[PDB]
Structure formats: C-alpha cells, structure tokens
Amino acid sequence: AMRQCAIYGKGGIGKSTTTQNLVAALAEMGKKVMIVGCDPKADSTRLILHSKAQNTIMEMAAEAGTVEDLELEDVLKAGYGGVKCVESGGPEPGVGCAGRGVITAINFLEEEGAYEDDLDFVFYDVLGDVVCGGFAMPIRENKAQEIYIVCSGEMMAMYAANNISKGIVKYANSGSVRLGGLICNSRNTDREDELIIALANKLGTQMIHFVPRDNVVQRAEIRRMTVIEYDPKAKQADEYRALARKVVDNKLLVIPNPITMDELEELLMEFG
Amino acid sequence: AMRQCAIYGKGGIGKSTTTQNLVAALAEMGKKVMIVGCDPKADSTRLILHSKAQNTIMEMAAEAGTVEDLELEDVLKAGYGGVKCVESGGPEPGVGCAGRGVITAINFLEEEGAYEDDLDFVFYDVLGDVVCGGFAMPIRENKAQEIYIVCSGEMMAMYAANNISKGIVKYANSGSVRLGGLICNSRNTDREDELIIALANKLGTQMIHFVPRDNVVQRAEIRRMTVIEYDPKAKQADEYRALARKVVDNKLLVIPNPITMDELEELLMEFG
Ligand SMILES: Nc1ncnc2c1ncn2[C@@H]1O[C@H](COP(=O)(O)OP(=O)(O)O)[C@@H](O)[C@H]1O
Ligand SMILES: Nc1ncnc2c1ncn2[C@@H]1O[C@H](COP(=O)(O)OP(=O)(O)O)[C@@H](O)[C@H]1O
Numbered sequence: 261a262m263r264q265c266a267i268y269g270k271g272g273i274g275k276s277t278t279t280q281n282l283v284a285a286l287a288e289m290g291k292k293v294m295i296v297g298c299d300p301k302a303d304s305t306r307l308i309l310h311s312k313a314q315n316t317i318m319e320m321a322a323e324a325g326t327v328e329d330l331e332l333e334d335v336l337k338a339g340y341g342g343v344k345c346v347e348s349g350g351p352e353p354g355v356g357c358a359g360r361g362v363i364t365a366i367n368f369l370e371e372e373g374a375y376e377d378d379l380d381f382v383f384y385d386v387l388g389d390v391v392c393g394g395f396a397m398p399i400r401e402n403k404a405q406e407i408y409i410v411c412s413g414e415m416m417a418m419y420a421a422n423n424i425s426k427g428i429v430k431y432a433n434s435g436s437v438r439l440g441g442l443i444c445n446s447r448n449t450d451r452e453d454e455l456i457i458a459l460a461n462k463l464g465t466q467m468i469h470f471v472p473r474d475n476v477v478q479r480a481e482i483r484r485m486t487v488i489e490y491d492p493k494a495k496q497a498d499e500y501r502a503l504a505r506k507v508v509d510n511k512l513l514v515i516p517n518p519i520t521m522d523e524l525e526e527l528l529m530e531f532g
Numbered sequence: 533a534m535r536q537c538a539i540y541g542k543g544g545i546g547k548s549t550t551t552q553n554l555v556a557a558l559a560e561m562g563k564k565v566m567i568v569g570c571d572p573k574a575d576s577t578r579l580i581l582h583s584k585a586q587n588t589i590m591e592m593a594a595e596a597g598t599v600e601d602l603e604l605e606d607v608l609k610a611g612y613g614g615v616k617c618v619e620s621g622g623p624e625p626g627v628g629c630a631g632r633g634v635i636t637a638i639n640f641l642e643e644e645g646a647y648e649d650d651l652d653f654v655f656y657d658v659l660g661d662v663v664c665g666g667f668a669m670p671i672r673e674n675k676a677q678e679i680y681i682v683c684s685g686e687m688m689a690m691y692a693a694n695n696i697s698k699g700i701v702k703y704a705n706s707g708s709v710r711l712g713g714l715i716c717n718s719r720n721t722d723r724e725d726e727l728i729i730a731l732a733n734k735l736g737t738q739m740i741h742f743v744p745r746d747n748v749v750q751r752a753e754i755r756r757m758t759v760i761e762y763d764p765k766a767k768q769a770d771e772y773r774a775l776a777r778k779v780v781d782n783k784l785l786v787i788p789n790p791i792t793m794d795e796l797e798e799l800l801m802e803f804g
C-alpha cells in the first residue's frame with residue numbers, strides 16, 4: 261500500500277519547513293516518499309532539491325504546449341534521500357482561481373502512473389487560508405486520507421485548524437478523508453504545548469508532536485537544506501526524527517468535532 | 533467626494549485590528565467612515581460594535597429569502613463614533629468559492645445607496661492570502677482606489693505584499709486602483725522599520741507608518757474595544773492617531789513594481 265497525507269495550516273506557520281524535514285527523516289529511515297507542492301508559493305520542495313524553487317507543472321505544460329506533452333520523468337525530480345518532488349503551481353495573482361493548478365497536477369500524476377507501488381508515503385503541502393477550489397480538492401476528491409494540521413498558539417492558526425476541520429466534516433459521507441492530528445510549531449511561548457493539546461482534545465484528535473523554535477532551521481534553509489541533511493546531530497534533527505516516528509506509528513484518524521468561537525476564546529484566556 | 537481604501541495583507545498580520553483602530557481615530561477627528569468586512573472570519577467590525585462579531589449579509593439574505601428582501605438599515609450597524617459597519621460573509625469551508633460573499637455584499641451596498649455623499653472614507657478589510665475570486669474584485673472591478681498593505685519583517689508577509697502588488701499591476705490598464713503604501717505592524721524585532729522602508733522603496737511606494745507591538749491592544753480587544761476607545765491616553769492610541777493623519781494626508785498612489793524572489797531574499801540577509 262501507500263499512505264497519502266496532506267499537511268494544511270495557515271500561511272507562514274511552518275508547513276513547508278516541517279514537511280520537508282519530516283520527509284527527510286522518513287527517507288533517512290529507508291522509506292520511499294513523494295512530496296507534491298500544492299501552494300502557489302511553489303517553494304515546498306526547495307530544501308530537498310537544494311534549489312531556489314522548482315519549476316511548476318503549470319509552467320512546464322505551457323512551455324510544452326499541453327500537459328499531455330509532458331512526461332513524468334521531466335516533471336518529477338529526485339533530491340535528498342531519493343525523495344521525489346513536484347510542484348503544482350498556479351495562475352498569476354488576480355487571474356483565475358489560485359487553486360486551479362492543484363487539480364491539473366494531481367490528475368497528471370495519477371494518469372502518468374506516479375503512484376507506483378514502491379512508494380510508502382505521499383505528502384501534499386496545501387495552502388489552508390481558504391478551503392475552496394483546488395485547495396479543497398485533496399479532501400473533496402479523496403486524495404489525502406490523513407490530514408495533519410500545523411498550528412501554534414496564535415489565534416489565527418487555531419482558527420485555520422478549525423476551518424480545515426469543518427471541511428473534513430463536510431465531506432465525511434464520501435471517501436475516507438480524516439484528521440490525523442495537530443502539529444504544534446512553537447512560537448516559544450509559555451504553556452503552548454498544553455494549549456494545542458487542549459485544542460486537539462476538543463476537536464477529537466491528538467497533538468502528534470511539539471516542534472521547538474530553533475535558529476538552526478534558518479541556518480539550514482539559508483543553505484537550501486533540511487536540518488536533517490545540514491546538521492544530523494542537532495537537537496532539532498532529533499525532533500523531526502521523533503515526529504516522523506509518530507506519523508509512521510499513528511493509528512488515530514477521526515472525523516473531527518469543530519468548535520465554536522466562544523470555545524476558542526475560552527482556551528486562550530485559560531492558558532494565558 | 534469620498535475616498536475608498538482597501539486594506540490587504542496575510543492572515544493574522546493585524547489587518548482588522550489596525551483598520552478598526554485607524555477608523556476610530558478618523559471618527560475621533562470628525563470623519564464619517566464605513567467599514568466593509570471582506571474576510572470570511574467576519575470579525576472585522578467587532579471592536580467598533582463592542583460585539584462578538586456581526587451577522588453577515590450572506591447569512592441575513594438566506595434568512596430573509598433573497599438579498600432583495602434585505603434593507604440597508606437592517607444590515608448596516610453603527611458603533612463607536614458613528615462608524616458604520618457591515619460584514620460580507622462567505623460560504624462554509626469546502627463549499628463554494630470563499631470570496632463569493634464579497635461580490636454579493638459590494639453589489640448590495642452599491643444598489644441600496646450605502647455610498648451616500650456624506651461619507652468621507654470607506655475601508656474594505658480584505659483577505660490577501662490569495663488574490664482571486666471575490667477577494668480580487670475590489671481591484672478587478674475598481675471598487676478600492678487606494679490599497680494599503682499591512683506587513684511585517686516576516687518573509688511570508690512581504691511575499692503577500694508582493695503578490696498583492698502583482699494583482700494591482702495586472703489591472704492597471706482599467707479603472708484607477710493604485711498602491712497607497714505599506715503599514716508595518718511590528719513583531720518587535722531589530723531593524724524592522726528599515727526593512728519595510730527598503731521594501732516599499734523597491735516597490736515604488738512608501739512605508740506610511742510603523743505600528744509598535746503593544747500589549748494594550750490585547751487588553752482592549754478582550755473588552756471588545758479599539759485602543760482609541762479603551763485608553764485614549766495610551767502611547768499606542770497616539771500611534772493610530774498618527775497613522776490616521778498620514779492616511780488622510782497621503783498623496784502618493786502608484787502602480788507598484790513587484791520584485792523577484794532573489795531581491796526579497798537579499799533584503800532579509802542584508803537587514804539580518
Ligand atoms: N521550528 C522552526 N524554528 C525556526 N524557524 C522556523 C521553524 N519552522 C519554520 N520556521 C521558519 O518559518 C518561516 C515560514 O516557514 P514555512 O515552512 O515557509 O511556512 P509555510 O510553508 O507554512 O508558509 C520560514 O522562514 C522557516 O524557516
Ligand atoms: N500592534 C499590535 N500589538 C499587539 N497585538 C496586535 C497588534 N496588532 C494586532 N495584534 C493582535 O494580532 C492578532 C491578529 O490581528 P488581526 O487584526 O485579527 O489580524 P488579521 O485581521 O490580519 O487576520 C490579534 O490577536 C490582535 O489582537
């Protein structure tokens with residue numbers, strides 16, 4: 261088989277950094293992994309490829325004529341640990357639906373046979389500030405069975421987590437998309453772990469891991485690397501190794517229970 | 533006449549807090565102001581109304597039958613200083629385009645005569661993490677002549693500012709939408725003002741004001757108030773009063789020059 265997971269969360273919360281470091285740690289354990297970038301920024305694979313970014317399926321299809329003229333070997337690139345990487349892309353701002361490239365990319369990968377039985381994991385890195393268009397398609401169309409949400413003690417981050425959870429409930433009667441857990445990407449504030457644990461419990465899920473704020477992440481990204489590759493002895497590398505182990509071992513996949521604005525506010529007051 | 537301005541920026545950067553405090557300071561000077569909430573969170577008016585939030589045009593139209601059964605006096609609410617407030621709303625997550633409520637609301641307000649000649653300012657509080665659908669409509673349809681972008685030294689915040697600027701250039705051949713300036717909402721880090729000044733200069737615009745990080749904002753929002761109403765002697769209140777004066781006096785409205793990813797990265801390295 262192969263596990264299909266999607267990482268959601270508000271912009272700037274740490275989705276791409278956490279996903280690429282998690283995937284490097286999985287490849288370091290010998291897992292075969294694909295990352296599919298589904299955010300218009302198009303930088304979701306740069307740390308695996310040691311690159312500035314990656315050219316997107318939308319840009320390459322326009323240069324080649326049609327998406328049918330593209331071959332999989334031209335779009336998929338292998339980086340650190342043999343992790344395979346692809347970027348969806350999207351239209352320019354103010355033109356067309358920002359999520360349109362996601363639909364194009366996922367359909368291309370399915371028909372071109374990218375989902376080979378030797379893969380163990382596929383990760384989709386998905387914009388979560390809105391849940392519509394192609395950004396909802398991994399949920400609507402049953403492409404990502406396990407959703408992991410990156411958040412932090414920030415009000416907006418927990419609000420985004422609740423909005424993603426409402427989209428999961430909307431489509432619960434079809435396919436098998438479920439919430440796998442919350443990943444706290446710390447802003448280095450007091451009681452933050454306990455906050456996110458309380459939120460996960462209220463949603464019906466779990467906090468799968470607490471990722472500390474660590475400046476070694478910036479020093480690695482400056483050199484276009486994961487912390488796993490940059491400094492395998494760093495304390496932060498062991499954190500991503502621990503996250504990877506827990507994702508591999510996770511068995512709780514639920515239909516979440518979204519909370520009200522009043523419950524959210526109460527959480528923040530309580531944990532000060 | 534009346535000035536029509538739209539505030540854009542990434543989620544959680546401080547758009548709604550800055551806009552409501554700016555508007556309170558304008559009303560405190562005797563200006564007549566309307567705020568139009570264009571973000572699906574629907575909390576863009578709560579500090580003027582002293583409310584939990586505001587019921588949205590989309591929700592009220594569904595309760596009343598059609599939008600034509602709504603009257604303006606039922607949708608518009610007056611708060612602090614006589615500021616008039618309305619919220620667009622939007623579909624639930626995973627259903628329909630998240631920006632669809634913006635189009636419905638702005639058309640309702642135009643036809644119902646909300647744009648009365650006694651208004652001095654209308655502010656639209658617009659989600660900026662994607663620039664498409666109804667969230668681009670203030671730019672595409674020439675509703676907001678002056679765009680102000682809230683950002684901070686955060687990479688994602690400056691990337692959003694550049695993406696909004698690309699949307700302004702896309703539509704420069706029609707109407708008169710222009711970039712009015714950048715507002716730095718501080719994360720209390722070194723050289724942050726100089727960073728945002730450098731970015732604005734590269735875009736062709738200006739940093740109109742630097743808003744400090746101040747805990748009095750949280751103490752006021754806990755009581756559902758602007759800092760202007762909560763503590764008119766606070767140092768932070770004078771900051772919002774200074775921002776309001778500069779927005780009233782601003783005459784520079786330009787078609788911006790979007791920058792490349794390499795220029796953005798260079799900025800961040802330089803200013804450490
Ligand atoms: N655990 C961490 N410690 C320090 N910096 C981090 C950490 N996680 C993310 N960052 C930084 O936060 C910024 C945004 O992260 P990114 O993964 O690009 O966010 P997203 O993909 O959610 O928009 C990047 O500069 C990244 O280096
Ligand atoms: N200058 C400031 N000082 C302290 N806190 C702030 C400041 N500006 C905004 N905040 C806080 O930041 C959080 C997000 O602000 P908000 O205006 O809701 O963001 P947005 O509307 O851009 O999503 C809120 O808790 C708000 O109280």
Ligand SMILES: [Mg+2]
Nearest residue numbers: 275276299301
């Ligand atoms: Mg990212």
Ligand SMILES: [Mg+2]
Nearest residue numbers: 547548571573
């Ligand atoms: Mg807001």
